[PDB]
Amino acid sequence: EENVQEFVLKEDCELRFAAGDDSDVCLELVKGYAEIFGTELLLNKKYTFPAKSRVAAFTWKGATIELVGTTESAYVAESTPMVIYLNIHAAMEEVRKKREEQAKAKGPRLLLVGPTDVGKTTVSRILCNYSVRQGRTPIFVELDVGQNSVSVPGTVAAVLVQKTADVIDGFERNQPIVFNFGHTSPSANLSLYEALFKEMATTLNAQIQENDEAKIGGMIINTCGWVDGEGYKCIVKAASAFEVDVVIVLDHERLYSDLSKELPEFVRLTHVPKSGGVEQRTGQIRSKMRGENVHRYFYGTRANNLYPFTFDVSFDDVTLCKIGETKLVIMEPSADIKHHLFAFSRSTKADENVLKSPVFGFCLVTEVDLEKRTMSILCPQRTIPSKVLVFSDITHLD
């Protein structure tokens, strides 16, 4: 906190910095205009970033920015792909306007594809914020069951974006449509994964019939980093199910080349480079981040603390079940359900409906008392929203 760094940013430059392993870093815009991943920074506001945060503060006109704290790295980059990300947004709004003049209108749908650590989530965040700043309400679709920015790991989720992402905490998670996949990787159950995003695409298509702003708002869809083998036809089916107009490929020439020949001719295909500010995460970093995502789901953030309940549930009051390829199996309260997430299915009964039903939310089984026939759960709300609890293979040690 007694260590300050001052930076001058010319137009079209970004301050890339990573917070230390131990320290927070406070960022303040002191002159000009700046944005962090598409969200405008307010002049003279203090943004505290937690340890190990990797952030870029970009400026369209020029800015002076102050960093307070211990940084692992901090420099001004003069070359960025930010204008590319702007033009993609500009192209979408052009499609919105052309479709709008038939009075309703269906907004452009965009599929982001590529391997891990290309800045795919970052770009999806930028594109959503720009649509919001344009006055539109896009639907952000999260297909990455490994690193999910809307719900917990092992989920396919979609959210209506009505406000720009918070600089620190990201997008508001206001009433998301969440499907429980139950695995960190699509390879664990390929056919179920495909059935879920098809059920996602169908649910959204019926719901945009009742919301005009959401329909014209369009979709920005983040896929997972699985591009090889079975991950490829998985991209093709995602493009098909969601009826996308544009596919953006980040930093993968072969994938771009393969898709150029298999995609329907009406689909626009754009290859873009990854930002020099994106760096390769190791396996254990993603694993650690999944646990931090689970913690965030129950306990919230520093800015918005959530207060989860810890109460006991009788095994008589609930039906525990597991999806396992697409058949449903009823679970008998074992010791092995401990530390596992469970989804509150929107289905009233534990039958065929569970497979394709969205969920109310999640709980974490913390204790299992087989001799008392009770379990301890961590839950976002006072009472359980559903008697049907669906097994997730994701484990969290709180």
Ligand X SMILES: Nc1ncnc2c1ncn2[C@@H]1O[C@H](COP(=O)(O)OP(=O)(O)O)[C@@H](O)[C@H]1O
The binding site for ATP consists of 14, 54, 117-122
The site partner of 277 among Mg ion, ligand X, none (C-beta below 5 to 8 Å per kind) is ligand X
Site string for Mg ion, 125-154 (x = CB under 5 A): ----------------------x-------
Instruction: Residue 266: name the closest of 247, 251, 245 by CA.
Output: 245
b/e burial code for range 13-47 (CB count within 10 A of at least 16 → b): bbbbbbbeeebbbbbbbeebebbbbbbebeeeeeb
Give min distance, CB of 27 to ligand X, in A: 13
Percentages helix, strand, coil for the chain (3-state, rounded to 5) are 25, 30, 40
Give min distance, CB of 287 to ligand X, in A: 14
Distance separating alpha carbons of residues 148 and 161, to the nearest angstrom: 16
The site partner of 54 among Mg ion, ligand X, none (C-beta below 5 to 8 Å per kind) is ligand X
Which region among 89-97, 273-281, 301-309, 331-339 touches ligand X (by CB under 6 A)? 273-281
CB 393 within 8 A of CB 322: no
Binding to ligand X, residues 89-128 (CB under 6 A) = 116-122
The site partner of 278 among Mg ion, ligand X, none (C-beta below 5 to 8 Å per kind) is ligand X
The site partner of 275 among ligand X, Mg ion, none (C-beta below 5 to 8 Å per kind) is ligand X
Instruction: Residue 295: name the closest of 205, 201, 394 by CA.
Output: 394
Give min distance, CB of 52 to ligand X, in A: 9
Task: Give how far Cα 298 sits from Cα of 52, 153, 183, 295, Å.
Answer: 21, 13, 19, 6
Binding to Mg ion by residue 124, rule CB under 5 A?
no
Q: How many other C-beta atoms are found inside a 10 Å radius of the C-beta of residue 168?
A: 18
Binding to ligand X by residue 278, rule CB under 6 A?
yes
Binding to Mg ion, residues 102-121 (CB under 5 A) = 120-121
Helix (H, G, I), strand (E, B) or coil at 203: helix
Instruction: Residue 175: name the closest of 359, 30, 386, 332 by CA.
Output: 359
Pairing status of strand 374-379 against strand 388-395: unpaired
The site partner of 112 among Mg ion, ligand X, none (C-beta below 5 to 8 Å per kind) is none
**Nearest-CB residue for ligand X:** 277
When the beta carbons of 59 and 293 are compared against Mg ion, the nearer one is 293
Helix (H, G, I), strand (E, B) or coil at 208: coil
Distance separating alpha carbons of residues 251 and 265, to the nearest angstrom: 22
Give min distance, CB of 369 to ligand X, in A: 40
When the beta carbons of 117 and 199 are compared against ligand X, the nearer one is 117
When the beta carbons of 63 and 354 are compared against ligand X, the nearer one is 63
Binding to ligand X, residues 1-60 (CB under 6 A) = 14, 16, 54, 56
From the annotation, which residues make up the binding site? 14, 54, 117-122
CB 25 within 8 A of CB 70: yes
Binding to ligand X, residues 212-231 (CB under 6 A) = none
Which residues on neighbouring strands pair with residue 40, listed in sequence order? 35
The site partner of 89 among Mg ion, ligand X, none (C-beta below 5 to 8 Å per kind) is none
When the beta carbons of 147 and 180 are compared against Mg ion, the nearer one is 147
Give min distance, CB of 13 to ligand X, in A: 11
User: What does the binding site for ligand X look like in residue numbers (CB under 6 A)?
Assistant: 14, 16, 54, 56, 116-122, 275, 277-278
